[PDB]
Structures are given as C-alpha cells and as structure tokens.
Symmetry: D5
Subunit: 166 residues, 10 copies
C-alpha cells in the first residue's frame, strides 16, 4: 500500500484493451487530465457488470471535464478481450468505451492496497488522481457494494473547483 492522499499516485503500466485492441497504458499517459482509476474483482462472473457499463455510458460527462476513466482487474488482457467480445446476452461485457487494464502480475493492485491475498483478486477500489498525477481521493468498498458515477462526478467536480478557487 503506497497510495497516499496528496502524494503522487503510484505509477502503473501494463496492457489494456482499448476499442477491442491491445494497447500499452501507463498512469503518466493521463498527466494533464484528471483520472478515475478503479478496480473491480473479476471478468466473467455471474454478476452483471453494471459499474463498468455505467461509467461507459456516461463517459462524456467525464470527458467534458477533462477527465478520463480506466478500469482494472487482475485478469489477463486476453480475458478482458474475450469478455468484451462476449455479448451481454451471454453474460459478457459487450463493447465498451473505457480502457480495461490488466493487472496479471498483481503488482498494481498491491501498490494500490486493493489486493486480497486470500482471493488473488481485488476488492472494489476507486481512485481520483489529478492532472498533476496527485492522489486526491480513495474509495474502498467491500466486494458486494458498487460505486456511484454520480458520486464520482461530484468528487471530480469538487476537486477541480478547489483547484481553481482555493
């Protein structure tokens, strides 16, 4: 657990699925933009992926405030792609507008203190990192409870307001 508020967010890099393709992605790619970086447990469970979908549907509300969204699980990039290429009808994600980062080595998860050593995947963790790479907000949820796009928006808008008028 290296993630500490008002300290630079721990650096990550890896392979993400972006618009159906493998792309290399790293935290510094988002420098100059605010980033919502969130973790979810696993691809292909029997629980509908409403969060990822929800952030995906409302991506323009983040893009209109100079904010990007990246989702991460410990699954491989190949699983992410397979999950994306599986139709929602069949319990897949369907096409998605948000990068799916793979944390196969588990190092990113550990560095963000969201890794569950017992399970080998993460809990539901969400991070708001500013345009300067500084961690501004940490949200950790026990597995069965998801996240509010509305509340993430409120938080992003609030830090940006604070940045300008403070």
């Amino acid at each position: 657990g290296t993630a500490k508020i008002s300290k630079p967010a721990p650096y990550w890099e890896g392979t993400a699925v972006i618009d159906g393709e493998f792309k290399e992605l790293k935290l510094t790619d988002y420098r100059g933009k605010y980033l919502v970086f969130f973790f979810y447990p696993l691809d292909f469970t029997f629980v509908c992926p409403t969060e990822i979908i929800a952030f995906g549907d409302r991506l323009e509300e983040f893009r209109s405030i100079n904010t990007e969204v990246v989702a991460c699980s410990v699954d491989s990039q190949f699983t992410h792609l397979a999950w994306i290429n599986t139709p929602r009808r069949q319990g897949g994600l369907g096409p998605i507008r948000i990068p799916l980062l793979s944390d196969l080595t588990h190092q990113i998860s550990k560095d963000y203190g969201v890794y569950l050593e017992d399970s080998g995947h993460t809990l539901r963790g969400l991070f708001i990192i500013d345009d300067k790479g500084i961690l501004r907000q940490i949200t950790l949820n026990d597995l069965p409870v998801g996240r509010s796009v509305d509340e993430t928006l409120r938080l992003v808008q609030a830090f940006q307001y604070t940045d300008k008028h403070g």
Copy 2:
C-alpha cells in the same frame, strides 16, 4: 494504518461530547449497530462545518436503519464543547446530535491511516463499520472536499441489503 476492509475495524476509546456532556466512548459500544465513524480536520476554522451539521440534521435516517454516526477530530474534548457552545452566528458548531470524539493523543487517527504527520490533524476520512465490528467501507478525501450524507446512506443501505440477501 491498521484499518483493513472485511477485517475488524481498529478499536478506539476516548472522551466525546454527547448532548453537551463529557462521556467515555469506545467502538465496542456500537457493536450490534452499524456505525458511520468519520474524521474532520479541526474545530474553530473559518470554514462552515456543513458536514457535521448535515449528518446531524439527517440522523433519524441513520437511526431508522440501525445506524449511528460519530465524528472525530484531534481537538480536545474541551475544544469540542467550546465549539458546540459557540453559536453558528459566531462560527461555532451550535448544538449537535452527533457525538464529537476527541483524538488528542492522535492514536485513533494513526490507527485509521487518516493522520497528517505534517499538519498534526487528519484529512477527511469516513468509515462504515458493520454491526459485528467489521470494516466495510473506507472513504478518504483530500482536505477541501467534503462528504455526501446521501452517498453514505446509499452505502449503509447497500451493505445491509447484502447482509440479508447475499
């Protein structure tokens, strides 16, 4: 930082101001009830204490779901009392329905990983602890951004739903 999701929330005890009086309070007093335990930086700043007030106004929405709310800063119990006995007109808290816990020794703050060694007070941290004493949720905000009573409610309701139907 001992606070870990789905692990027992770190034990605390100390003096709180409750209904204008000094009372000893400890985490175990809340066993059997869900607890919203939150930290704020300092009493008597020039910023209106809207959060404490907001949780105070809407306390019955928590009590109707078997949930209590406790606020904490590193200020002494005496400061808390003085802040409470100072009218909102003059920048005080005014009377309040929520216990104000004092973390004078700073140990509670450290155990919850919300202490700022540089400042000697906390950031805005919020914790949702269940009826069995288990940490379910951790919310850490950089100083200038407050908390949503609505979002805390959503979270408490969600964990209780999960407790019954899961």
Copy 3:
C-alpha cells in the same frame, strides 16, 4: 520452488472446473493413482490450445493405466469456465474431461517453480506424481514449445514398470 524429484509433491488445492462446474480439488484427492499435473500460460490466447485438447481427447490412454490428468493456469475458475464454453471452432477449449484448476493467487505456480514474476503467468511445466504422492518427473518448457502426450505416456508407463519390477 519446493518441488523435488523423489520428495512428496508440494500440496495444492483450489477451485477447478470439472465438467462445467466449480469443485474444490486437491492433490490428496489423487492418492492411489498416478497424476499428470501440468501448467499452461493463459486461457483465451490467439494460439489453438492443441496441447490441452490432446490430453483431454486421449484421456483414456491415461485412465486405463491408473493415471489422472489435471491442467492449471493462473486464470480464475470463471475464465476457465468461459473458455470451456467457447467452441474449438472459435479457439476455445470446448467441453473437456480434464479438470481445469485455477491458480489465481499464484501460490501453486510458485510452489511448483513455474511462475514467471515479470509476466504474471506460468511457463509450460509438467509434473508426474506417483500414487504415493511422490514427484517422479519434471518437464519445464520455454513458452512457445508444447508437450507430447506420447512422451508423457512413455514416462508414466516407465515409472509404473519400474514400480512393479524392483
């Protein structure tokens, strides 16, 4: 890496997909039989899983000489199930008669000395464990090169011949 020829094979347990269902599985369940226990890198890659298919399709050549086969990768059991439910025409596994063990936490791969720290998955490693639970054979292949069912059969038959005839 605690796997040593002529020493008991490191104990392992985890969730496996056995005929489309999640079952807890352990090394000790194989006591009384020879076990071929092999690691492959990742589900859902763009290589045909010819080698896993081969062991599954020729499984009776193993069972008729008192031998089972168990496959393992670092993928979750949910990824394993989905891969199984992907037809071979689409580079999936199709239905399979061999258990697919999940090593999500990586402990089993590490105990077997097959984990790759920088990739987060295993290489191609195969282990032949006798009916007494003793490790008799270790085969470790760099990624691109697969394993022969005929060579595995030869080795199993030879240890068995060796067991019976002094």
Copy 4:
C-alpha cells in the same frame, strides 16, 4: 527530550496567535533577548487560566529587562484564537499580549520533554532561554500546580546579574 541546561535550547517553529493574528514564529526570532517559554496543558478547561493571564498582565516587568514570554499548548492556532476571543468573565483568556504558540504535531512538546504520551497534552513546564539561545533553567510541574511570575522574574534577573558580573 533534547533540552539540556547550558546547551542551546531545542529549535522550534510553528504558528502562533499574536494580537489576534496567525504569524509564523520561531525560537531564533528571540535571539538578542531572554525568553521565558512555557507550556500549559489545554485551552478551554474549567480552570481559570490565572497563570497565563499573570504573565500577560505583568509583561512589562519582563520587557523592561530585555525579556520576552511565549506560551504554548498542543491546541491548534484556531483554538488559541477562539480562546483569546472568549472573555475572562466566561473563563476565556481575553485579549493577550503574549504569543500563543500552537504545538499541534506535538514535536515541540516532545523536543522539550513535556509531552504526556497517555493524555496527549503537556504538563506545566517552563524554560528560561538566554539571549545567546542557551537553556539556563527548567521548571517542570505536575498538572495541578501553576507557576509564579515573581519566581520567574527572580530567576531571569539572577541569570542576567550572573551574565554581567563574571
């Protein structure tokens, strides 16, 4: 505790309330003058702050012999200000001519050996620091017993006599 008679007094700096305003203050600002530097436990307690008032009210007996006085507790500068803006008729300090230094982080109290680990505040400790920045006198009192301005004057006058006459 690094405070030693005839050694330089441990350096300190922090925010103080000086005539109703926040000013950064440091030990080195007192170079050239004697300094009486004393700790009291807590603002806003149910004891009249007779002892602080005494030093403030007789401040000229110190300034006319080249001596300043600085008070300190672990309270924040915001608590100090509020206490100052509480009239003596209501057990506040009323306006005061002596700086009230804040030791929020407790580092100054610890460096002076006056911090109480289990209470989170200091005891009653008073230090006489000469114009060369050297510690000449240490007075440490258990909580209930206060300090005499007359005794402090006597000690200051004696070190000064001693300084001039060999």
Copy 5:
C-alpha cells in the same frame, strides 16, 4: 536519567551527615512525609552556601507541614562533615539542621539527571517528592543561580492542597 513527574522518584541510598554524625539514609525513610530533595555542586567553594543555610534556618516551616529537606552533592561524607565543622566565617557551612547526603559514586546524580559529565559534579537541581514517593516537581538551574525557600514552600503547599482538596 530516570526521574519523571508523577512516577515514583528514583530510589536512592547513601551516607549522610545528620547532626554531625554519619547515618545511612534512604528515600524510603521519608515515606509518609513530603520531601524536598536538592543537589548543590560542591563543598568548600569560594561562594557562601546561602541556599543550604536558608533551608536550615526555616526548617520548622517545612516540618510544620509534614515536609523534610535533604541536600546532596557528589562530595564524600567526610568532606561534608569537615565542611560543617568549618565555621561560616572561614568559608565553612557551620552546624546545620538539614542532612547532607553524599553521592560519591555519582549514581544518584545520574538517576536524577543532574550530573555534569565534564565537570564531575551536579548542577543546582531540586525535586519535590510526595508522601507516597511520587515525584511532583523538577527544578533545574544552571550553576550560578540558587533556589528560593519561599518558592519551594509555595510548591509544597500547593501540592498538598491539591492532594487533599480533590
């Protein structure tokens, strides 16, 4: 050393000169009474021993409030006796009513944190110990400056008042 306010005063024992005779003396002998225990630097110096005389002349004022007085230096008991047997006129102490404790080994001075490693004697240190053997007060003066019987009397009386009156 080991002297801390509100902790038992560090135990000591040694030879003292009481009314012109060597007696074994210990801290525990004073249990049930308050004790003013002070250190002075050296016998036979070129300075008049005003402190020790003043405590001896006004002893009944301490005895009448259930308080004893013990003085101590690093000098041997033989030096103490000779100093007493030297008439005040000639730089001696003359007959005295206070015990003169010898701390030849330096251990007592070290335990009270008054020993000066480079000088081989103590600074001017004074300790107020209550009837239960708890240390209530620590006064440490740089060499040139002595102690006030009035002040000491005030502190003893204040601790006894606070003891009894709640």
Copy 6:
C-alpha cells in the same frame, strides 16, 4: 541451483573424453550451435547404457540440425575413458561419438540442480540450450527412467522453428 529457463545456461568447464582422448571442454565452445546437455548417474553400473548409445548412433540427426550432444556424470575422466575402453559385451560403453564430461568436483551438477546430496551423483537430467547460450528446456527424471532421442529431437526442432518463424 542456478539453471532457469530463458536465462543463460550456467557456465561449465571440465575434462571430457572425446574420441578416446582427454580434452578441456566448456559450454562457450558450443556457442552458435544448439546443445543437448544431459547428466546420467554412474559409469560401470549393472544397467546397459542405452540412452548414451542411442544419442551416439543417431548423432547425425542432431548434427544435421546444427545441434551437439554432451553427456555428463560425476565420474572422473579416467573412469569415463576406462568405461569407453570396456566392450559393451562386458558392461562397458564401447567406443562412442558423444563427449563424456566429468563432474568430479560436483559443481556442475549442483549448478544444474541435478545433484543428489545423499547419493553423491546426479539424477537423470537433460537440458536444451540454444545457440545464444540461453536455456530453453529442463527435463528431470527420477533414476530408473531414461530419455528419448525422438522427444529430444522434437524439442530441439520446435525451438529452432519458433526461433526463426517469428
């Protein structure tokens, strides 16, 4: 030991018997060619050396794919030469085309993790090393079971194919 897949094979050197003569041999001599490097337990045992013979008879099949073969045991070079100079009829190896490396000091066996501390010799271990000196394959057999030239040939060919064809 130090042998790891996709790392340079641990360096070795020693005396070998090549066409009936002692020659100094080293791993680096084989750079630019593939190398099958294998260990066998002991010369002069009561078992026919079928493995070593088979590799020697079919050597041209390795030479024609730019691959050399080296066999090794803990026996001395003198024992190797005598074993070669013993006719197969009488339990000897007879003339051979593969070098017989001596690992008298045991260091090579230890570096390859094939040494048996309680027996004083190796198990049956086989290593495939590429032309760049990188280790591609590790095969470790419990004592009774030998090695297949077909399998070895298959693995060499597969690594060379994958080398070239992307």
Copy 7:
C-alpha cells in the same frame, strides 16, 4: 576436518567392494583391532597402483598383529569393482583382499581433511587408528608421492608396544 590425534577417529560408513561384492562398511566394524585407514586419489589412472597393491599383497603382516587395512577414494563402488576386475598387467588392481571404500559424497574425505576442493578427489592421506578407535597417526602426502608399507608397520608396531608397556 575433524580428525584430531588422540581423539576418536571421525566415524565413517559407506559401501565398499569386499571380495568382488558390495558390503556396507563402517569404522565401528574395526573396534577391537588397529586400523590402517588410507585415501588415494583416483581409480583407473595411468600409474600402476603400487601403493595399494603392496598393502594388499602384504596384508598378513598387518593381520598377524591385529591390524586391518582399508583403502578409500571418491570413486563409486562400481568404479572400484571394475578396477579390481581389470588385471594388474593391464593397469588395473586385479583381485585385492583389502576393502575399497567408496566416498562418492565426499563427506568422509572432508571429515578426514583430505579432500581437494579444486580437484574433486583426495590427496594421499593415511590414518592409524587404535583398537579403541582413537586416532594415533596422520600422514598426509602431496599427490606424486606414495606410502611405505614398512613405515606403516613400524608405526603400528610402535603404537602397540607403547600401549602394552605403558
């Protein structure tokens, strides 16, 4: 190693060739008898084993004075047998009435302090051990220089006379 004059000779055990057969042999088998215990470098070298031949051919000069002889090298027991089955005319040992002790593990050589770490065999070490198993003599020779049967007899005879006549 641990071999020390007038201390018990370091225990050893292992497999030896005794009249064409493999027997387990230990130092304790020689209790009640003097033992000449010697090491030689290697079997099958290009020098006639005149040393070993001589002790064997002259064994009765030892047995008739209650003394046994054991030869040792790091060669395996199979190498020892092959060597014995090689005729003296052809460079071999021919039949021999002294056990050839195998030290494959090197432990015995190391306990006797005769092992050459750089070469992986022994120098020429001879040890005379009495009937109580106490080490009475150590003779260590650099490699090219052999031992004398007459000198060894003289020492044995001398030690026994010494035993008998005080």
Copy 8:
C-alpha cells in the same frame, strides 16, 4: 583500564592544588623527568595521611634524582585546598610541596584501573613513569595498607640505573 607496563602511561590532565593555588596539570608536564604518580582514597578521613605527608616531607630525595611526585584522589580541588589548610595537628595535611590532583570526573582513576565502582573512590595505586612517559611500575594495594617512600625510591633508583647501564 589502559595502564600497561612498558606502554606510554595513560595521558591525564586536570586541576591540582600547587602551593595553595589552582593550576591545570597534565602528565606531559613531567616529560624529561621520572614521575611517581599515586592515588589515595579520600581527603578528610579519620586517619592521619602519613603516606602523603611522608612523600612530601621527603620530596628532595626524589628531586635530587630527577623525579617528581604527584598525589591524586577523586576529591575536588576545593576539598584538596581545604584539606591542605587544615593543620596536621587537627587531622589535616598542612602545607605540602606535592601537587594534589583532583579526579572529580573519575576518568583518570578509571584510566589507571584504580577506581572502585562500588565506593566511588580509588584504592591505593602507585605508578612509576619514566622520563619518556613510559609506565615502568604498578603497585596496587587494598585500602588499609599504605606505601613506603623507601621502596618507591629503591624502584626509581633501580629503573634509572637500568636505563643508564643497558
């Protein structure tokens, strides 16, 4: 301590009483001269200082052979002076022509290995040091037994003759 025969005598320096005055004195002041350096327990005891008196009264027997004498105890220089100003008739030293070295810190006594940790003074130690500052003699006596001026002279004379005549 560090005092060793035929090694340089441990350096010392401190304040001594030399003809009624305080002088700083160091071991190096005696280079070019033999030095008799001795320790005695304490000033002002109830035994006449016959030892010290004797060396003082007989000093010319040392000076006429290029030898000086220094006496030391742990007493302060002020105690030494008082003692000197006490008449021999009254138990004191009377005037004395030998320096009385003060060892208040105890360091010198400890360097000479004569300090008694339990008593806080020295035993009776005498040291003969040559003109090059090399320690030639150590005489240590348990407390109740004094030194002989005739023996010390005989040793000094013996060391000088030895120096002169090889």
Copy 9:
C-alpha cells in the same frame, strides 16, 4: 587480566617442583594461610636468580607469620628441575626451599595479567593473597627490576595486622 584487588585471586593449578620432586599444586592448597605468589621471566638465563634465592633464604620469616611463597614462570616442570639441579656456579638455581610452579600453558600468567604476548613469558609480577583466597596486593615490575623481601614482609604483616585489629 582477571586478577582484581579484594576479589578472589584467580584459581590456578599445575605442576611444581618441591624439594626436587614433581607435585600437583593448587591455589586452594594455601587456604588458611597468606600466600606470596610471584612470577619471574625464565629459567637458565644469564641473570643471577637473586630474588628466588633471597625469598628461599628467608623463608622462615614468612612461615613464622603463617605465610607461604610460590614462584612461577612459563618454563616446563622439567626445565625447573634441571635448573634446580644445576649448581649456581654453572648458572643454575641450586637447591631451593620454594616451590617452582610451571605455567607451560601460559594460562596462569594470562589470568594474572603478567603475560607478555610478544615474548612468550611474564614480566615480574608479585601477588599477596590472604587466608580466604582474596587478592590484597598487586606489584608489577618491568623486567629489569627485581623485588624486595623486606617490602614483601612489610606488606604481609600490614595486611595481617589490619585483618586482626579492625
């Protein structure tokens, strides 16, 4: 050195020559009497052994005060005998009335702090041990300078007198 005044003299034992005969001698044999224990450098040197002969000649003066005398050097007991058996004319000791203790191992000299590590023998050390085995006196002379019997008598008589008469 382990010898320390007023502590038990380090235990010793060894072989002494007493009236031309080898006897085992121990420090404890002297319990109930005073012991003059002294070391000289070496037997058979060109210096006349005056000290040993002096103590020998005057032995009755010690025995009449219940005191024994033992002489020691690092020489073997055999050297002591030969030296005793060599006439003073031809550079020997001649018959002597004092035990000559051998410290061949050097351990006794080491315990007594008289051993010269660079020479392999002792300087001239003399020790006075009382009837309860407590060391009372340490005399260490640099090599050239011998010891006085008169001085040694004086010290013994002094220790015995102060033992008796308080």
Copy 10:
C-alpha cells in the same frame, strides 16, 4: 592449523640455538632448499632424545640432497642452550648439528596444528617444505612414537625426483 598441503608453509621466525649460539632464524632463510621442519615435545625430560641425535648424526645425508633440518619445541632458547650444554650422560642433548628453534610464544606450533592446548606443548609433528616454500608432507605422531630418518629421506628424495622428472 594453517598448514595445508601444496600451500605455502606458514611463515615462522624466532630464536634458534645454532652451534651453541643464539641466532634469529626464519622460514624464508631456507628458500632454495628443501626443509625438514619437525617438532618434539620438551627439553630435559627423562626420554632419551634419539630422534634429534639421529637426524643430527645423519645430517650430511640431507645436505648432500640440498635439504636442511630444523627441530622445534616450546622451550625458551635459554632452555635449548642449557639442554645442549648438558652431557647425554647427565640427561642432556649434548652438542648437536641441528638448529633448535624456540617456540616460546606457542604461535608457531599453533600455525602448524601441532600445539596441545591442554599440555602447553606439541605432539610429534614433522613437515617437508620444498625449495619454493610449499608444504609437501605432514606427519603427526601421538607423543610416544618417534620418527624415522630413513622414511624422511625417502620422502624428500621422492619429492625432489617428481619435481625434476615431471
């Protein structure tokens, strides 16, 4: 022990008796020739010194093969002389042609691993050092049993022959 075959013989130096005279002798003085370096227990014992006399008598047989002989014990050089000067009739060595090296410090015996810590002397060790200072041979006899000059010649001639003729 630091002596090791085929390593440089441990350096030694000391005082030897050579033709009745004290000379400083060093191992390096023997460079360019072979050296028989041997230890015996002690001078002046009741055992006839046959070994030393034998090597002495036959010294020309060594000198004609470019070989010197040095004898050592722990005795002082003075003891060696006296022993040499004592006629064989009266239990001495008598004139001898071989240097008698003194190892008074015991350091040479320790480096050679011949020192008996419990006796303070050596057992019977013999060492053959070549012309380049390399140790070629170690012979260690338990005390009673002496050494043979014929055997020692045989070994020297053997080492020199194998030095020359490859």
